[PDB]
Subunit: 205 residues, 5 copies
């Protein structure tokens, strides 16, 4: 406990928090999705509710330490409130997102952080055709709300959404599920914005 | 990170927060709306739910800096809780507004601030006729709850509500959508109050 | 900004907060209602939902200042959390009251405070007869939860509820709406309690 | 204000906050219920919703003062967050309890505290027979979650639930309503736990 | 009070909080369930809601004391916010878990902590067959969200879920209810992970 208390103290009480990335010191955030269930489809409002886990990873020089200085501690867990986290948001949500898991991150001595919030999201999706063989496709994208591509870049480790924890007795069968990095330009802004587009095709039964 | 940490420290830890505008030092806030979806219409209570983004912009002398003094930083992102924000509210809401996006603002070296909260709002609207060709019109206005025109003035950059992110498969088609600055007088107060009236005409299909 | 910062500092950081009224220094609170809409009537549970604004006014010697000492500032706005506010509550609510407006008060150099929270309230009301010509009457009273008439007295400026912002396309037509000071005696306590009874008669169409 | 400010200051500065009772210094808490309405009955889930006020009273020697030392102040009001409160809870709730009143307590110069939260509670009750002449009986008990009878004892001033503010036009007529101190033994623990059982018999009309 | 105030001060104000377990100083958490009611079954979304109490127990050296040094105090109660608690969570929840009890723990002089949050949980379960004689079985597992078996080991004192507080008039009869420790290795990770699987078989009537 003593070494870990000392490490945490040195990292969090002896320097200011990371103020976030800039053009001169950009940050890459890696993002993948584990889809656990499609829990609700509402055809009168065109809303669909998912439960999923959002794997986020990034790295900061300010979170590095030498394990030999701290009794060979190579990683630790800490409340997400103790560290900077990126402002990744769903772009087509219809309700505030509901957090289903403790808000705790894993920090490793090379400065890398892993944060995996489980969440329920309501989003815009017309589910007409969900009860046919072809099913229906919807999409929702995730990205920084206020940082451009020049400050926060996103990547994925894979194009396939992790379906290995998908609820075996869901009302809905997943026909396809992809996660794809996209570069968007909007008319407002000259800077590109980066998102990951989660596209899920699904049907009943 | 070092220059940005120093800038933030100089701005936020070395003087009190801006106490808000007065008659002697008024403020102009620019306001525009991006309508993303009409998500619910309830004819038994005359409530309609929108999801929209509220672009807000204003400028403070107390947020200015010379980029040459701070490693050429010309702007940065910061939690909206670190700065004064204006008390703009919907005047005919029926439920507390639900915030859908991180509460983070962009501050620029000329002292200008941009804040773009995405929100779900329930408001008073009789939707009778929504299922006809003519559709139905409702309106909701937005302005400061407690500052008059002598302290906070509003303007818009345009009269047209931004419909470029409107959900392509909404239950509702937008026939018209305007945002108009208006001057209101209340019996309580001799000073005029300023609002922006969001008038949306829409129908099913 | 400098004068206002100095005033706020002198008022709030240089003495303790007002600890509330006592028998020796009672306080009069003025109370008036602006009824904006009857948003819901539920005959299966006997609940009715209103949206209204509650004008509250009181005066404290400890909030006085000479405008000549503070660059001629005669009033300012401040977060309701910076000041004492009275514990006025609805006595027949069925859900926590939902605040619809920013919680900001106006303080004037004579020590008077104006606070106007907009609210949605669910309360006990049997709406049988709402769909007839005679309509239906319900009532809900508002007063301090724990201060007796010896500490907090209530008055109204008028007996008529302000209907000038009542939603023109409500499901419900207001036949009558009054606000009336009353004295209540409880078996527990020898001291009378003061409330304002809001009585609204209404019907459909 | 001055004497009261001084009293509050002196009481805040006497010790840390009361750490709660122990075997060596137990505490008796007095408990009574005012039943305001039965607001909802759900026979598909066996839930019933009540609105009631929970009178709680206890006494601490550390909160005593001589009124002659403080300009004859014999009592004052203060936020419930400024003092220790007991952990009395409903034992068969199905939803978090909703607080309907300001969280303010009354402290008296003999060290007694009165706290009267108004609340809406959903709880386990099979309402079969509610629509007959005999009606239906349900029960919910209230006690400390973690203090045994050796640390917190409960009493009631009366066996009869106060029905004097029961809503005159409720869907439900109250046939009987009692509050009875009981001793419960759990298999986990050798110590008895004390609760007050609120038993309400009621029917429609 | 005096001795207890001194003990709490020595434990909580004189050293940092426990930073959680590591490979070098692991922790065992004991876990058991008291099932109070199955409150809702939804076959259109495959969600089931339970109300249960989650008994958690662990031990820390940093929470030990000699009772002779503190007026023979052998245990005390304290807000769960004063101490580290483990991040045990349901792995297939569909909603944020609702806490139904005060968040207070019992600490004993040997450093052991008992924490018993009562909760309402919605989780993934297909309730087809609930209305037959055989009934239906569902399952949900609980474990640390971020600590492996090398940091947090889980055990149960018994395989049987405590049914002694199960609501006598539930819609649902419990045919079987078990809690079983399971040790997993996943391909992603070299560390073993531990969960407790709560398996409940039930039917109507
Ligand atoms: O709409 C604007 C916008 C409009 C006019 C000026 C500016 C903007 C930028 C922020 C600075 C300058 C951000 N956004 C949105 C925030 N988020 C959602 C879409 C865009 C991009 C990412
Ligand atoms: O009702 C009052 C009011 C009443 C009596 C005195 C005063 C007021 C002002 C504040 C100044 C002094 C604010 N308001 C509301 C705030 N907002 C909504 C309606 C009005 C105007 C715009
Ligand atoms: O029940 C009591 C009560 C009981 C026993 C002692 C005392 C009380 C007072 C507070 C002082 C002393 C307030 N109340 C409630 C708070 N509010 C609503 C109902 C009553 C009256 C006004
Ligand atoms: O289950 C236990 C329990 C189990 C093993 C040890 C201990 C307990 C006590 C706390 C002290 C030591 C409290 N409780 C619950 C909390 N509350 C409700 C049910 C009981 C009784 C009162
Ligand atoms: C901190 C820094 O790099 N500042 C540069 C510096 O070259 C100069 O002040 C100017 C160009 O003359 O542009 C900027
Ligand atoms: C600081 C400031 O603005 N002061 C002036 C003051 O000189 C003048 O006497 C008053 C007129 O009544 O108006 C104001
Ligand atoms: C400050 C104050 O109120 N002091 C009063 C005093 O005038 C009175 O003589 C006494 C007995 O009644 O109680 C005390
Ligand atoms: C302050 C205090 O509690 N002192 C006690 C003492 O009186 C008692 O006889 C003994 C246990 O029997 O432990 C110690």
């Amino acid at each position: 406990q003593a070494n870990l208390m000392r490490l945490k103290s040195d990292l969090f009480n002896r320097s200011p928090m990371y103020p976030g990335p800039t053009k001169d010191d950009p940050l890459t955030v890696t993002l993948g999705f584990t889809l656990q269930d499609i829990v609700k489809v509402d055809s009168s409002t065109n809303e669909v509710d998912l439960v999923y886990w959002e794997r986020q990873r990034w790295k900061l020089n300010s979170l590095m330490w030498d394990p030999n200085e701290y009794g060979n501690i190579t990683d630790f867990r800490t409340s997400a409130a103790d560290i900077w986290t990126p402002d990744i948001t769903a772009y087509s949500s219809t309700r505030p997102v509901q957090v289903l898991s403790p808000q705790i991150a894993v920090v490793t001595h090379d400065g890398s952080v892993m944060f995996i919030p489980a969440q329920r999201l309501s989003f815009m999706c017309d589910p007409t055709g969900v009860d046919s063989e072809e099913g229906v496709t919807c999409a929702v994208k995730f990205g920084s709300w206020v940082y451009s591509g020049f400050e926060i870049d996103l990547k994925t480790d894979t194009d396939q959404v992790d379906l290995s924890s998908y609820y075996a007795s869901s009302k809905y069968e997943i026909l396809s599920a992809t996660q794809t990095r996209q570069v968007q330009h909007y008319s407002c802004c000259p800077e590109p914005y980066i998102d990951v587009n989660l596209v899920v095709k699904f049907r009943e039964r």
